[PDB]
Amino acid sequence: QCQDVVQDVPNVDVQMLELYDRMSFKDIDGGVWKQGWNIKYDPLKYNAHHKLKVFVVPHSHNDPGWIQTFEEYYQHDTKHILSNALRHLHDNPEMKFIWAEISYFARFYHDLGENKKLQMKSIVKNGQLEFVTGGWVMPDEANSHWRNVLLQLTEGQTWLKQFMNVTPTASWAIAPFGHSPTMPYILQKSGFKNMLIQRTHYSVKKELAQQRQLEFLWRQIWDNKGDTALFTHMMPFYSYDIPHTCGPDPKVCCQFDFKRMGSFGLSCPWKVPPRTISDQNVAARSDLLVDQWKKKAELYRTNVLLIPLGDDFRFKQNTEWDVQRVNYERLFEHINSQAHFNVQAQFGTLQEYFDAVHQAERAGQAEFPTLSGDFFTYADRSDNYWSGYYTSRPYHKRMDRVLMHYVRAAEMLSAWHSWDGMARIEERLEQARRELSLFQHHDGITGTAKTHVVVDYEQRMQEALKACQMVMQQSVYRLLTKPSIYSPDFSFSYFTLDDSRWPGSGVEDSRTTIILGEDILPSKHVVMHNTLPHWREQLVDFYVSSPFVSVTDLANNPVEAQVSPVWSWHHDTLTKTIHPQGSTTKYRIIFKARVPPMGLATYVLTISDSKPEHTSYASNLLLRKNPTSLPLGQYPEDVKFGDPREISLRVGNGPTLAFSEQGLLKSIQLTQDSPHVPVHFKFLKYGVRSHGDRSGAYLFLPNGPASPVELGQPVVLVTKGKLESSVSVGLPSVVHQTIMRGGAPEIRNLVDIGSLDNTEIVMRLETHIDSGDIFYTDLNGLQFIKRRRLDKLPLQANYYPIPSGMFIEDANTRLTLLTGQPLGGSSLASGELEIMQDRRLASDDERGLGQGVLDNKPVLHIYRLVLEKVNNCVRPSKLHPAGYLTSAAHKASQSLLDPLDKFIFAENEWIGAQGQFGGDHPSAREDLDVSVMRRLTKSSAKTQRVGYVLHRTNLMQCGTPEEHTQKLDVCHLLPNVARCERTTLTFLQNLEHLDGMVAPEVCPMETAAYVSSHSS
Ligand SMILES: *[C@@H]1O[C@H](CO)[C@@H](O)[C@H](O)[C@H]1NC(C)=O
């Protein structure tokens, strides 16, 4: 019996939206604890029978790229940290150390000799070195897709299981800029029992500290029962550094960072240095430190206290290891032997802390509050809200989503077969998984790294994309070639991928033209892949060398097609206009491809002398004053010209869209009779303050509300076809395109902020929808959370991550904007949605980057815009913290994130070609996805194993019967199944042995993993 995720409002002790509504967010000087209060404790609270147990947990924050590349940091810092950790922990059996970033650890371990590898395994086995989380990285939680968060977790933990024989059940997230409940969701379904977070709004820290609610059972916003709950520890202070982790007073704590005495080139900003602990000072030093501890202990419910001891790239030098260890050893010996302190202090690990906490809990010493919600948007001080990185480096943000999909497609396409080692499938896939996983780092996708580091991430992702293409194309060739004919060269390109949207038209001329000709090649095979587990029809396009091309399927059935020109926009530095030029030698052919669930479908493009029967040609209308001619070679329809004017378009029986004379949407009419609903696109700009704090890669600090971009009299291009129409306009910084295929329009923005310093470009939608102060944004492409605009907070605080979609609604109408890339956005007034396109910032914003953002490049952002009637929809009550997509909006999101893949046959003739693969695959219910299909065994394994991650979303019931689908049982997708098991999401632990080898489908909002075993 599935939990109902719509109708029952969870009863929880803290609900973060409710908390937000109540809190005053005053930023007052709380004293030595600047954002708290002077903590008082009763010295009689602890005694002989009730001691304070203190765990000091040494750690070292290692960024996989930030100010230096991954390899640069590894060479200069991390390899030394790990080498000296091995030595010092080996030699000092009571010393402890926690490690988070497996990308660095794997890099190090593989360079070790066998002697050292064994020493390393020993200190892990004995508990001295403990892995926390065990992901490839410590990912950003704002921009990251849940699928990639899982990918990187799996990458690190699979490595740890194989080489260290351990799987972390405690998570450590000290650094992501705000925190998402997507983390406890994934972690709890991956065997975790505890997690730790740090970067939350200073006001939230204060509020929760006051109620001792810094430790909580974090459940999902829709979870009535509490089964998703994961124990969470929120750190109470401003930083994870040593001054902000011993207790409330950094002036005191800094004195217990023994790296800060001078020889290391570090010091205490509070002007009192650390002093070496001696017999003459240990009593006084201990009195100071124990007092700090006991103050921190006031903020929590048990007699077990966590004291992290670390900072960025700490525990490098041998001398640093000694200086920290020896001084702390002296403090522990004194403190533990002075009964009057009633403290037992020691080095410990994160798991040890959590174990002792739950022992206190079980002894009836504490009960913990329940909590739901998220921890965006983070501010570490004053009005410095970290909403800028929701948008920074948007090119690579978009790239992340493209690579996300190519990794899935490559792993899925290649999973169907076992491959010979010589094929290098596993090699290429591991590379792709690792480069994407690396980019999930909280300085990767966030766009907060130095210019040369961003370049490194981009290069790595480009290599991953090539790896995916190689795997995908070899897989297509095998799946669609008669087996007795199949003769692979594992280095040969049988197909090239054709991608219409990445890097995108106007970004890179990368697409190949299918060159046909009576005197060279009459025809060309193309293949579409559909990674979704349901039948899909979708328009696909290819470049061809002639407009006289027709399409057939592999049964030679004619397929209706449309040919359009290839239009490119040019900032004409002579006329000072932005205007389109048409190709005279290549054309776009568009047709509907119909592709099996998780399958393949083949089509043939054939040239003729004249207009083919089943091919139509789009009309084109250029709207501008002072037109010049636009010849189009063989294209059979002459371009038409006119003065700027309002226009209306309708494709198929879909919506009718009206545009302004500047080429921007002004209204949508859903059906013939229905109203023309005001929906207006507008481009505006935010600036930067000329006094006080400046915006940078992290911070969004606007100098007031956005000002409209002055548009002049822009050139508007209207293309009208039977299958696809569009309106495109050359705006300053943006070629804005609205594309229509008979349903929700697609929006593409080619964004080039050029040399506009201290500017952020925003795309806004203005409607009449009576949303008031409510809007919805998603978390990690997993769930939609209710947002409430708060005027008591500054503009930038009302910006949230838009990792994949946002909506506003009233009783009757909803507008949903879906994205192909994470960007920052808000609803700043009733009826509005807005989302940032790019930002170019001259100054550094004081968080350590030491540069602005002046490395912008052209990016093609993609969207779907869904206007819907929702009055018949069964929606959550007004008190529910969640929202849910409709079927239409969810399908539009899928179109952006997981489109059909397109393959062009490279050679002249494809001998033994087949028309279809997967025609017999079950077409599963629309709310179910096979998020991951991955073969887990190499070819030499007698028992083959294939892992599946199934995700079921929740779609609103709006009265559409939408019925008759087949049960998807992933365990029978490959033949000769011998066993079927439910696993953790990482595939690392078997949870359930499945009757009849049948994998059940999952509940709405649930995610499960299954592994099928095959004897043949
Ligand atoms: C892996 O750890 C387990 C306990 O979880 C132990 O039984 C097994 O021997 C270990 N594998 C080794 C030491 O190779």
Ligand SMILES: [Zn+2]
């Ligand atoms: Zn970091």
